[PDB]
């Protein structure tokens, strides 16, 4: 049915960890489908300290119609998927924010 | 008070009524008690009932009432659900608390005149039989058994039977 | 058209006290009425409450046993009879009182579909 | 407080027949009567309200009648679909007693 | 019924009122007939005609009332469109039912009230020259003839001249 | 004019009424005045300003009502708006205008029941001791000093001991 | 102030059927009334409907030859005569029936534009 | 079924003058009269309704009156664009009857 | 439970006017009674309006040299008192006319907190 | 027009005894009475509206009672935070008038 | 008065179209106005097939 994609990108904090990591600067992701036909070019040299990490990343997805085919072209900075979904829609939902347990009734 | 009858009239309700609504109390020489009218208080429960019942069900429901959270650069978007949320809401509270108020006036003097009604139908009925008397009370003039009760909550009066008794009792002397 | 679900199957030993629900379907005001289905007698009301005056009238014969409550918040009445005996073994069926004509009071108007209640060994 | 006396306690007949069943009561208990058939192992069902009103979705063979303590229930004619026992109801005071069931099989 | 004259003490309608509403019917001497209350009937269906018009006219007009379209990106804007065009139906739907109720029942009682008053202006034209009797009718002591019903209707109606007829007629004997 | 006193058979208003709303005139011999009714008027005072005050009070208050602007390519969103912002104000201005005219008709049938409770609040202090006439006035039969409008306005208005006077007026001669 | 916008203009030979329109500004409830202007003779009214009551009165010298209906979903009056006859040249006026105080009936109130009806070889 | 015969049946006058339209009725009309003035060539328009209301929009120098069988429109001055023909309808009980006509021309 | 905001404190030369608000907390239509405390001396009320009756009453003792006007747009009551004189120096209070069974009419329900006004060289 | 004679001028007490304050008026104002206690250098405040009822947020140690010219203010005990001066109004005619001021001090 | 102007630029889903096609790779498209001055720089290698 129609099945959710998820992904990233990773922004290293300068242009060593590019150039030591993925051996090569100027790396582009494009993921491509019916609809969906964005490109993502990462290649930023610094960034603040955040939980301690300095580098940055950015998670997109997107939704795979029945019958439909999505395509990931890349040659660097990519976060593959490893556990893709298959949602079936339903419509009316949304997130509570509490901090009760959980029960039955 | 609309009508006049509750607070009116009838100066004060009776604690022994447990049965139904608008009773009565025939301290008649057979006995006395407090026997309900049981048309006119099932009928008004009846039109008690339809009215809440129609507040509760009109209302329609949905899965979602709730709004959605959005980050720090769709403050249109927060801001433009606040305000739907807060007008939603704001146009709920004042039609619910004037519903709530205006029906609460309706169900006050529609009980005002059930017991106004009745209180004409029984004076109909007895026309000059029975004189009046504050509180909504009443004084048969003739002699007036249990069977008084059967004709009087069942409507079936017939004033001309007692009519000559009532008309000796007007002077007495 | 108010669908009326009661409770399930369900048996208990003499002297203890039993719970059979009639959860609606929507929320309603109108009276609940129970009533007990014997194999080989006839039916017999046994208590109920109407939502307005709030009081819970009950048969002269079952009054104290039996107890009634149904929280206006749920309109979801209860069915409570202490001290259960093995003659009550029996089908319960509750009523929501309600005709075409709006909700009527002394009435039945829809009914519910029956909960197995015995009580033998 | 008041008993439902059914009247006649049971008789049979076939498809498409005059019966009545006479509800009998010692107070009157003006025209809050019901009338209700009672299939054998289901839920029990009303057919007349209030002594003359009729229930929605009800065949129109049923006809009640009567006030005070004599009522009345003319079937104009009888299905393969309605044979079941019989209950009348008061309702003009607490308590609410039921009837003694009048069955009706194939003759 | 708040008022308790249709479907109270007027136990039921007449088929033949055609050109009126709050009709009569005169069983006198010259003929008979079922003559409207032309003033009561044309106030009352003026006022009905008031009500229905504002019902209408208030509503207000724009030139759309049709929820846009999105894509699949923009998830939050198709859910919010559909909570404010559900929401503004849920109030709509709310608020119409429970006026088309509440203003039923205020016309129901507004006819109540107009067969009440005119039940009591005729009483109180009258005051004791007719005895009243159930339904809502009338029983003239004196004779009567056509000019009583221009003289009622006209709200003219003299007692003294009719007044010792009455007087004769209350005992007869 | 539901309950029919106001415009109905108490023809005309009083331009002399200051002090009070339900007044009276007392036309004796000790002299004249328009004397209100202070028990009555300061009750239909009270629950005018009730409903006034809870027209105004229940509606909730927020900081702003403001539409936003949007720039030349978020249509969507400026119509969006102008859809919430019209319908809120298509809502406000069908519920604020059947209030004000509904509960301007509560408001007059109001004023049309304090007047009828009144008269049939005297009509029953005084039952026949004083004849009903016209434009809803009295005319009392015994002879009726200023100690009468003491009693009248208090409700003390002890029937016996004027009962015999009215009994002797009835016919006088 | 309901702008009245009556049908155009037309022509027919004896012996038919005549449809003038009476299409209103907007929807209302109030009575009809139409009304004949024959050169050289003065007004009478011929018929008209109550959305109140319902019934379609008429003149008592031309019931069966007309007929007024006004759909209250459009509120627009529609006007027929069977039968059509040459003295019956005429312009017809439709009426509203809405004044200053609301809308009142047995009056006029606001009234039509005219529609130029006559009937000749 | 009631005729209105109008009366005058036609008069001529000047600029600010002192006119007044009878409206003859055989039965009671009550008070439900009106007042209509008809331009040559132009849609007709009321001026009083009920006998005693005045319409909006309209100059205060018509003042209408009578009930029962006798009515009267007293105008307090003629001015040059009030001149046409007047009719008088009944709608106490239908069917509703216009009148003759009253003309008023320059003298 | 208006919380009523009166105006400061001025004093001002004999034979002049004065200007004491009411500014209350929010809308509201009750009656407004105002109050005199001259120092040593029990109160005594002067003058008052009614947004109903609309009419500005006063003590048969005070009409003309003082008037009463609170405009119902912004409920605020506003005092003035024309030809000050000395032995008017005092502190008022300012009444809203509202206790806890709604706003009652011919009670004070809550105050205000008052404003010194003292006439003097 | 109607003025309320306050009896007794002027008593001392002491911490939980019985005092009673009346209000005597010419002219019979029904049951429109009020009770005022005015604590020096404060806001007066009012403890009895109708004679009866009894503002929110009292003690109840305070009931009024009376009608007509006769009116009365019965304090069940006296604590030392309720000694002040007492004024009663009238409201049944306008205009208004309060009272003198019975004073209560520690004995 | 207000005119509408539509435009549209292509993604060939190689690059030996945009080789073979416009003689050149990195092709932008800068449509300028007063109140529009958003750039274009289709370059992509790859689609699905969607309608043939």
């Known amino acids: 049915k129609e099945v959710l994609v998820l992904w990233g990108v990773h922004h290293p904090p300068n242009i060593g960890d590019q150039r030591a990591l993925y051996h090569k600067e100027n790396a582009y992701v494009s993921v491509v489908s019916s609809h969906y036909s964005r490109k993502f070019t990462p290649e930023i040299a610094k960034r603040p300290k955040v939980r301690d990490q300095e580098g940055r990343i950015n998670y997109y997805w997107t939704l795979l119609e029945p019958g439909d085919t999505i395509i990931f072209e890349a040659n660097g900075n990519l976060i593959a998927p490893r556990y893709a979904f298959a949602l079936s829609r339903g419509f009316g939902s949304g997130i509570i924010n509490s901090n009760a347990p959980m029960d039955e009734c | 008070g609309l009508f006049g009858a509750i607070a009116g009239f009838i100066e004060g309700g009776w604690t022994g009524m447990v049965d139904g609504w608008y009773g009565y109390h025939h301290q008649n020489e057979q006995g006395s008690g407090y026997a309900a009218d049981q048309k006119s208080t099932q009928n008004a429960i009846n039109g008690i009932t339809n009215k809440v019942n129609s507040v509760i069900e009109k209302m329609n429901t949905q899965f979602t009432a709730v709004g959605k959270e959005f980050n720090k650069l769709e403050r249109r978007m927060e801001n433009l659900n606040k305000k739907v949320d807060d007008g939603f809401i704001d146009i709920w509270t004042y039609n619910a608390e004037l519903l709530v108020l205006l029906e609460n006036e309706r169900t006050l003097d529609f009980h005002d005149s059930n017991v106004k009604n009745l209180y004409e139908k029984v004076k109909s009925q007895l026309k000059n039989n029975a004189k009046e008397i504050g509180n909504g009370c009443f004084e048969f003039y003739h002699k007036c058994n249990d069977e008084c009760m059967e004709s009087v909550k069942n409507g079936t009066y017939d004033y001309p039977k007692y009519s000559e008794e009532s008309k000796l009792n007007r002077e007495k002397i | 058209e108010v669908q009326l679900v009661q409770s399930g199957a369900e048996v208990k030993k003499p002297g203890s006290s039993v719970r059979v629900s009639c959860k609606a379907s929507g929320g309603t005001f109108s009276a609940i009425s129970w009533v007990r289905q014997a194999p080989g007698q006839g039916l017999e009301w046994?208590?109920?409450?109407?939502?307005?005056?709030?009081?819970?009238?009950?048969?002269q014969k079952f009054q104290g046993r039996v107890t009634i409550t149904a929280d206006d918040s749920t309109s979801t009445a209860y069915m409570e009879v202490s001290s259960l005996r093995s003659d009550d073994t029996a089908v319960?069926?509750?009523?929501?009182?309600?005709?075409?004509?709006?909700?009527?009071?002394?009435?039945?108007?829809?009914?519910?579909?029956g909960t197995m209640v015995t009580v033998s060994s | 407080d008041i008993q439902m006396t059914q009247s006649p306690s049971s008789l049979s007949a076939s498809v498409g027949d005059r019966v009545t069943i006479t509800c009998?009561?010692?107070?009157?208990?003006?025209?809050?009567?019901?009338?209700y058939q009672h299939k054998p192992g289901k839920a029990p069902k009303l057919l007349i309200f209030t002594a003359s009103n009729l229930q929605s979705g009800v065949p129109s063979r049923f006809s009640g009648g009567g006030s005070g303590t004599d009522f009345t229930l003319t079937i104009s004619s009888l299905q393969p679909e309605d044979f079941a026992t019989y209950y009348c109801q008061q309702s003009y005071t607490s308590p609410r007693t039921f009837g003694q069931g009048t069955k009706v099989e194939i003759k | 019924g708040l008022f308790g004259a249709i479907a109270g003490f007027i136990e039921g309608g007449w088929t033949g009122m055609v050109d009126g509403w709050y009709g009569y019917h005169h069983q006198n001497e010259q003929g008979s007939g079922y003559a409207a209350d032309q003033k009561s009937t044309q106030n009352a269906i003026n006022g009905i005609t008031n009500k229905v018009n504002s019902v209408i006219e208030k509503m207000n007009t724009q030139f759309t009332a049709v929820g846009k379209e999105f894509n699949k990106l923009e998830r939050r804007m198709e859910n919010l469109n559909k909570k404010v065009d559900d929401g503004f139906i849920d109030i709509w739907t709310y608020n119409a039912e429970l006026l088309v109720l509440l203003e039923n029942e205020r016309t129901l009682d507004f006819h109540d009230s107009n067969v009440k008053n005119l039940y009591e202006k005729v009483k109180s034209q009258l005051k004791n020259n007719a005895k009243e009797i159930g339904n809502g009718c009338f029983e003239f002591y004196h004779k009567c003839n056509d000019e009583c019903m221009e003289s009622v209707k006209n709200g003219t109606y003299d007692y003294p001249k009719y007044s010792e007829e009455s007087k004769l007629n209350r005992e007869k004997i | 004019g539901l309950f029919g006193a106001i415009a109905g058979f108490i023809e005309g208003g009083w331009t002399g009424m200051v002090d009070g709303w339900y007044g009276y005139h007392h036309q004796n011999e000790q002299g004249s005045g328009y004397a209100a009714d202070q028990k009555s008027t300061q009750n239909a005072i009270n629950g005018i300003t009730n409903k006034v005050n809870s027209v105004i009070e229940k509606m909730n208050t927020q900081f702003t009502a403001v539409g936003k602007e949007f720039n030349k390519l978020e249509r969507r969103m400026e119509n969006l708006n102008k859809k919430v912002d019209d319908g809120f104000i298509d809502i406000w201005t069908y519920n604020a205008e059947l209030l004000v005219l509904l509960e301007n008709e509560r408001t007059l049938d109001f004023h049309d029941s304090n007047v009828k409770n009144l008269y049939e609040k005297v009509k029953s202090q005084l039952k026949n001791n004083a004849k009903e006439i016209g434009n809803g006035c009295f005319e009392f039969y015994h002879k009726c000093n200023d100690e009468c409008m003491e009693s009248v306005k208090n409700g003390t208005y002890d029937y016996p001991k004027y009962s015999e006077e009215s009994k002797l007026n009835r016919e006088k001669i | 102030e309901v702008q009245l916008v009556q049908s155009g203009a037309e022509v027919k030979k004896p012996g038919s059927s005549v449809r003038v329109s009476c299409k209103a500004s907007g929807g209302t409830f109030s009575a009809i009334s139409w009304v004949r202007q024959a050169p050289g003779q003065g007004l009478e009214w011929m018929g008209g409907?109550?959305?109140?009551?319902?019934?379609?009165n008429y003149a008592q010298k031309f019931q069966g030859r007309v007929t007024i209906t006004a759909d209250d979903s459009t509120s627009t009056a529609y006007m027929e005569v069977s039968s059509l006859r040459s003295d019956d040249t005429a312009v017809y006026y439709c009426?509203?029936?809405?004044?200053?105080?609301?809308?009142?009936?047995?009056?006029?109130?606001?009234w039509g534009q005219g529609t130029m009806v006559t009937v000749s070889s | 079924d009631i005729q209105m015969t109008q009366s005058p049946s036609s008069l001529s006058a000047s600029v600010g003058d002192r006119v007044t339209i009878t409206c003859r009725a055989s039965?009671?009309?009550?008070?439900?009269l009106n007042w209509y003035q008809h331009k040559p060539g132009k849609a007709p328009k009321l001026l009083i309704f009920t006998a005693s209301n005045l319409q909006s929009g309209v100059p205060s120098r018509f003042s209408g009156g009578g009930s029962g069988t006798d009515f009267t429109l007293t105008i307090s001055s003629l001015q040059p664009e009030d001149f046409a023909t007047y009719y008088c309808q009944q709608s106490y009980t239908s069917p509703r009857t216009f009148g003759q006509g009253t003309k008023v021309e320059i003298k | 439970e208006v919380q009523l905001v009166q105006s400061g404190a001025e004093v001002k030369k004999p034979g002049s006017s004065v200007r004491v608000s009411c500014k209350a907390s929010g809308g509201t239509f009750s009656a407004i009674s105002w109050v005199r405390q001259a120092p040593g001396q029990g109160l005594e009320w002067?003058?008052?309006?009614?947004?109903?009756?609309?009419?500005?009453?006063?003590?048969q003792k005070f009409q003309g040299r003082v008037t009463i006007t609170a405009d119902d747009s912004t409920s605020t009551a506003y005092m003035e008192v024309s030809s000050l004189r000395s032995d008017d120096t005092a502190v008022?209070?300012?009444?809203?006319?509202?206790?806890?069974?709604?706003?009652?009419?011919?009670?004070?329900?809550?105050?205000?907190?008052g404003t010194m006004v003292t006439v003097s060289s | 027009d109607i003025q309320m004679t306050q009896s007794p001028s002027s008593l001392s007490a002491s911490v939980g005894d019985r005092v009673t304050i009346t209000c005597?008026?010419?002219?019979?104002?029904?049951?429109?009475?009020?009770?005022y206690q005015h604590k020096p250098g404060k806001a007066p405040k009012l403890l009895i509206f109708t004679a009866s009822n009894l503002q929110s947020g009292v003690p109840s140690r305070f009931s009024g009672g009376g009608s007509g010219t006769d009116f009365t203010l019965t304090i069940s005990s006296l604590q030392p935070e309720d000694f002040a001066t007492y004024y009663c109004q009238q409201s049944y005619t306008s205009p208004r008038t309060f009272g003198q001021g019975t004073k209560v001090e520690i004995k | 008065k207000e005119v509408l102007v539509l435009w549209g630029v292509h993604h060939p889903p190689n690059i030996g179209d945009q080789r073979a096609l416009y003689h050149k790779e990195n092709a932008y498209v800068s449509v300028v106005s007063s109140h529009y001055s958003r750039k274009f720089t289709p370059e992509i290698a790859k689609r699905p097939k969607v309608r043939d």
């Open positions: 039965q009671s009309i009550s008070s439900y």
């Open positions: 009426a509203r029936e809405e004044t200053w105080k609301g809308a009142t009936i047995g009056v006029m109130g606001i």
């Open positions: 409907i109550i959305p109140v009551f319902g019934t379609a």
